[PDB]
Design a protein around this ligand. Sequence first.
Ligand SMILES: CC(C)(O)c1coc(S(=O)(=O)NC(=O)Nc2c3c(cc4c2CCC4)C=CC3)c1
Ligand SMILES: CC(C)(O)c1coc(S(=O)(=O)NC(=O)Nc2c3c(cc4c2CCC4)C=CC3)c1
Ligand SMILES: Nc1ncnc2c1ncn2[C@@H]1O[C@H](COP(=O)(O)OP(=O)(O)O)[C@@H](O)[C@H]1O
Ligand SMILES: Nc1ncnc2c1ncn2[C@@H]1O[C@H](COP(=O)(O)OP(=O)(O)O)[C@@H](O)[C@H]1O
Lengths: 795, 795
Amino acid sequence: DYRKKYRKYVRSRFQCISVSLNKRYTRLRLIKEHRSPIKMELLFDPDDEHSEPVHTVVFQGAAGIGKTILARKMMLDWASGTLYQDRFDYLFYIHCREVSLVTQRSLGDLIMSCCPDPNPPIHKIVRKPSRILFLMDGFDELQGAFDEHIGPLCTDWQKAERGDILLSSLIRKKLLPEASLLITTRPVALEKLQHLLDHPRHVEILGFSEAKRKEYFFKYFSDEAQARAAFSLIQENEVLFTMCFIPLVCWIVCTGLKQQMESGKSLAQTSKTTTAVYVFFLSSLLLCAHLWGLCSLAADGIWNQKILFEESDLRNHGLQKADVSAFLRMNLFKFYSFIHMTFQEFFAAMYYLLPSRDVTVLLENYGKFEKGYLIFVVRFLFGLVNQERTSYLEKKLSCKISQQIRLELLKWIEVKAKAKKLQIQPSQLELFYCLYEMQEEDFVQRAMDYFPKIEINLSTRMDHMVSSFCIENCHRVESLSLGFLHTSSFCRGLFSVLSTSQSLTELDLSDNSLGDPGMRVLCETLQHPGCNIRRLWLGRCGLSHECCFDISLVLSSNQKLVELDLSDNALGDFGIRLLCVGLKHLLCNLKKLWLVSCCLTSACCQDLASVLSTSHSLTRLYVGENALGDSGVAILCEKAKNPQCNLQKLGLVNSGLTSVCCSALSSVLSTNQNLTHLYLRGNTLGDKGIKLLCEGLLHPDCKLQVLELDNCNLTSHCCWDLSTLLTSSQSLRKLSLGNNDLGDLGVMMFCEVLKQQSCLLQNLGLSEMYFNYETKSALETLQEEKPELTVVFEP
Amino acid sequence: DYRKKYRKYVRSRFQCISVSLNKRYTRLRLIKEHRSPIKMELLFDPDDEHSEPVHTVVFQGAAGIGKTILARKMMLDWASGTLYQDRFDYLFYIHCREVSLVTQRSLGDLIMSCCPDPNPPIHKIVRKPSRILFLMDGFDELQGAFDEHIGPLCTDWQKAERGDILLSSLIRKKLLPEASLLITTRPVALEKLQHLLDHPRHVEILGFSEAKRKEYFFKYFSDEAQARAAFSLIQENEVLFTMCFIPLVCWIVCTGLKQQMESGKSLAQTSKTTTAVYVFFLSSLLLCAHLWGLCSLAADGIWNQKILFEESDLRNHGLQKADVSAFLRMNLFKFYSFIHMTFQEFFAAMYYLLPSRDVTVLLENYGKFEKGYLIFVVRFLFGLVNQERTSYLEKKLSCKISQQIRLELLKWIEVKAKAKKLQIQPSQLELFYCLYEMQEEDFVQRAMDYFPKIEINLSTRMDHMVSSFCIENCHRVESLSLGFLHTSSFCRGLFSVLSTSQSLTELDLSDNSLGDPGMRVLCETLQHPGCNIRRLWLGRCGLSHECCFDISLVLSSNQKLVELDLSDNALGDFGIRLLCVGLKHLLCNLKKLWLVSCCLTSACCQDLASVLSTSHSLTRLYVGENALGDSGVAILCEKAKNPQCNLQKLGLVNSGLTSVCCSALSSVLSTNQNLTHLYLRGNTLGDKGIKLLCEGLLHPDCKLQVLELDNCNLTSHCCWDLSTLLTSSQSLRKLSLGNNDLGDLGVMMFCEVLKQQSCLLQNLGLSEMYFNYETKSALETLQEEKPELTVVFEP
Ligand SMILES: CC(C)(O)c1coc(S(=O)(=O)NC(=O)Nc2c3c(cc4c2CCC4)C=CC3)c1
Ligand SMILES: CC(C)(O)c1coc(S(=O)(=O)NC(=O)Nc2c3c(cc4c2CCC4)C=CC3)c1
Ligand SMILES: Nc1ncnc2c1ncn2[C@@H]1O[C@H](COP(=O)(O)OP(=O)(O)O)[C@@H](O)[C@H]1O
Ligand SMILES: Nc1ncnc2c1ncn2[C@@H]1O[C@H](COP(=O)(O)OP(=O)(O)O)[C@@H](O)[C@H]1O
């Protein structure tokens, strides 16, 4: 059968990368991304049979993380008899470097290119569209492929179409919808796919763990003692060991070490950044005319989208056949390419330091993946313009480089930081990569003074290290938002430089899986004498009652903390009991406290009240969305009635309240001169509860200014009472009353009351309340009648 | 309800054929045809629910086998309440004789023609397309219906289309796809219809068995004594009783006997062939002007495709209304037709002996069914041109006939036999039918001298008799291939005339269900002193160890047998033990023996070796595809090392071998001067095994010439060893090495070795081995460098 012939063909083709792929291969860390380990067998398997088409799978990875090697290993395993031997007919390796937009070819012609025979049985293949898979590797082919509106989609596979249109039709499941796809791509090209996909399954590639680094370093060196020595020399440099999570850096450093050892020379060289790694690799593998030819060749390829280089183009750039080095890898189809596109990048940067030679036009034109790649370009550029590496590079390669380009890059980063450009293109972490690449402290200080509001999302150890370096070097940061993915080991490094910073005032960690150990580390950090953090948000950090002990320690030790948030954490009654110990200290200067939806009950209300009568600083307390109950609110109000209480804003939204507690609240309104705001949204107070409250709001000593009563189940019966409030309350300024069936007569009474000049009110919230056209017209008459009084009643 | 009205209509219409159909009907033999008894209820039922339009059923039968009667009986049974009273709404009797291509009508028009009412509820019928059956009887209507490219297919049953296009749309399931079909057809019309079908279910009609012949002979004659007398008179004629498997011949002979008995005359007339039957029927039912008119009418109908004759056409051929005979059946729609199309055939032939009158133009124009029918034409013509029947026919009917037409038919068969025309039109058995029809020993002997390579398939006793007659009368047959369908009863007669032949040398019976009794009969045949068979192939004949006893008897008795093949038969160790008794006899001249996939083990290897050291004639032994093992191969080799052993070619393909036995093989290569070939494909010898073998092939006394090592699990490590062979082996000429991962360095070493003039090798098989373009180009440069050395490396 031709099936076994094709299997043997792909097994022979993908056996080596020569060196054996099976010997070379090391397992990578694969994790599912989209949330409401992973194996390939279950990867193509549907998690839910109800799910819309599973067979679309997108692999996400950095440059050199091993997407191509992963796809080739999948083909090798499938051919060798390991992956889906149950039933899955064919796998087609569409290497997007070969695919070009200008050429007009059909799917049959593409399979012809992927088949070993000049006349494979294509019709039999098409007869089984459900058993066909396409490994689309490297969606990073060129620019302008999809930035325009997609033209007509082709379903007739015999028809010849352009590369872009054919790929769009294949991806969008219009051409052979039953065919399966697996696309290895970049995050920006991931955004492009998300603009061209419908329910795909996303899988991330992380690379090598420490054990996998052991495995790779043992597999590379044929001699076990040599491998042990090389890895031992790697160990004492933490930067290299952290960077080695990417297999490409492992390969480069192993090649350098092997070549130096074959020459019998010292292996002790160390590279601070990626640029230093590449520079030492080139120096080991390295006349100036040949360097200029290579640089111009790379620049031409970058500008004109040409990755596979022909002999004519090679000749155009002043390079002879005798100039072929170990950098260019050959593929006879006669074509030359680079080992990885990052090398073409590095040589293009070297060109820009040694195609237009102005960096401004390079920076202006962005699009598709290449923008980040062009930023990746400047990344190596950022590395090369350094007071240390430039001198040694010029000495080694006998070259000359200027430094106005560094000032131009500084202007570019200034513009990028000051530019708002939210949620557009790679924004924050990549700039930190560039700054860490340069490693010039003075430039870093001059460059990060434009950042202050910093928001980053970290997923790898290298991300943690670069963020730590940048935040430590910064001196004008005020607000800092951290996101964590897939912790405490590198949190111990981040939080130290967060504490040492003398300009930070905010610290947002909401919506993370910080956990109890992470919160313990953060609290150990916050106890530092030099800490300056004044606001700390911890919403939905997955915390429990265990973190409250450490938070209480911080509150009893830290005199600068002013605001704190703990919303959506299951602290519980015991958590609040632990927290109130710190809250009652004399060194606790906390002013605002959020406890919305902390799974509290009426039991903890005895503790919080003790804080209100004792805390000399706590003014604004929000305890909404908790089953406090009428008894709990009564317990709070029993201590809140004291005129010495400093409480100003109180939040009881959706706190499961009835009218029974309202009288107690009224007492506070009669006695507390400090309570200016009070939110009661979502509580079924009722008309009797509103009357009991108005008994207190009408008191001469009441100083309330804002009151919310949304969704309080208020009918027309109470509409008179509030009217009596409006003419009499000399302090109330705002009042929200949405989500009620007050009725048209009630709003008529309100409008009749408000036309007087004796009302000091300035806002009424009647949104989500539906009224007939006469009432609406009355409200417009009122709203342009009284400009200072605002009513919201939009339909 | 109109359903019951139409049921009553068809029940009344199909009650008689007058005589009652139920009284007349006799059960026919029905069998499924396509392979990887049958009853109509399961025949419409799907064997597998996964099977694709099961509802399409095609019936295959000879002329007069009873396809029309079977369809009419099915319709009568369905109307009477016997076939699918569960649920199946309508069956429509589309008699293809009525359907014409010129007339343009719709499906509703056809149903109206098949309906008794001028305005049937057609829309209600279309509303239930899954409960509609179309019974297309006689797909052999006319010529040119489908020989051209099929035009556009019509799906709108309202639209009027031509007969050919409408039938194509209906059959191809484009017009009412949910409708079921049942087509009765001819084998050549089967070919054409299968060129218009997609997964149909084929059912073959065989006719009457001996019990069914008894039943029909009792049913026809109303008097039991008369029926017994007629059957007793018929039975003593063996040829007539064999031809009686066709119901039409039974009807003709019964009508003749009944008419002769009514006239009180003798019934002793005997007919050797079908032509004699028809001639005696004519004599019983039979002025010369009327005969010429009938003959011209039949010829005109044959040439212009007109089966239903009008009175205008009747007058056109000099036939008056007073000339209406007992043959022409009338159908008032006013139309005349023949009893069967075979009668129109016979009268067209009679015209050709008594429209163009040249037989050459008759023979040239063939197509559709009619070609065979036209051959059917000449079949009766072949009967009529005889030294015996012609004189009696001329005396009876007062006619004159010439004999140059016989010479023209002889030239036609000369051309047909000389013409290659493989797998095109009716080729071999039908010519035998014509020759048996003529019954002239001189003409048959002169005509069969150009047959020699005969390949025929037999399914009925009539086929056995005609083939036996033709083979017995032949004198220049060399090769003879027999196929059997659905045995020994007529094999006992066929094999006798096979043995008596003094020119036969080969006898191929591969892929039959010959079985042990059949092989016993064949062995009794082969022991005849006059047998001349020299090669006997018996692959996959379903043989077992029981036939080996008889084969050993033959080998000990038959001294002319030279080659014998027993591949794919479960002979087993005991079978080989029985065979080796005959193989070791002094009168056994067998030279070549095949035992591929005979379910052998290492146990039988002790016996085969005893043959090698004893058999003075066995030179080529093939025992591949058996689980012989290393021990078995060692047992063979320890006897094959003998210098006096005459073994030349040894086959061990896929014999489950390892390197352990290879050394033993090496010893044979060092000792046996006669071993010139050795096939080891599929055995995991390995590089160590290849080295052990090359220890032997490099011996000065080794005389091997061809060696195969495909799929031997050979890596690059052994590539040096074979190279040492190439420069040193002075006898090897061929070497095959496909299905290996030899590597590019290995083929480079081979090419470097081969460019020397000292290499006597002439062939290397590197197919299915995949190499890069440099290795490819080197391979061509070598192949045009050395024209005498051929390498196969096609991609
Ligand atoms: C900011 C974010 C999320 O890390 C990102 C955005 O875009 C990309 S990437 O797709 O450009 N790939 C890379 O940067 N790979 C890459 C990395 C390092 C070192 C090297 C490479 C390539 C060779 C040396 C160290 C971390 C990533 C990554
Ligand atoms: C070679 C092969 C397989 O027997 C064949 C090929 O084509 C056809 S047939 O379809 O032309 N039908 C017939 O010959 N019927 C037929 C036969 C006999 C006698 C008569 C008839 C018709 C009336 C008398 C004796 C055997 C067949 C048959
Ligand atoms: N599983 C692995 N084992 C060993 N090396 C790997 C592995 N995956 C990737 N590499 C290294 O990565 C380099 C190629 O990376 P590549 O697959 O091109 O990354 P990408 O697909 O993201 O461009 C190779 O030099 C190879 O040594
Ligand atoms: N089951 C049967 N019982 C009795 N006679 C039959 C039967 N089937 C066919 N015949 C005979 O065959 C003749 C018609 O054959 P027909 O059905 O037209 O063959 P085909 O359908 O192959 O043309 C009739 O004269 C009838 O006597």
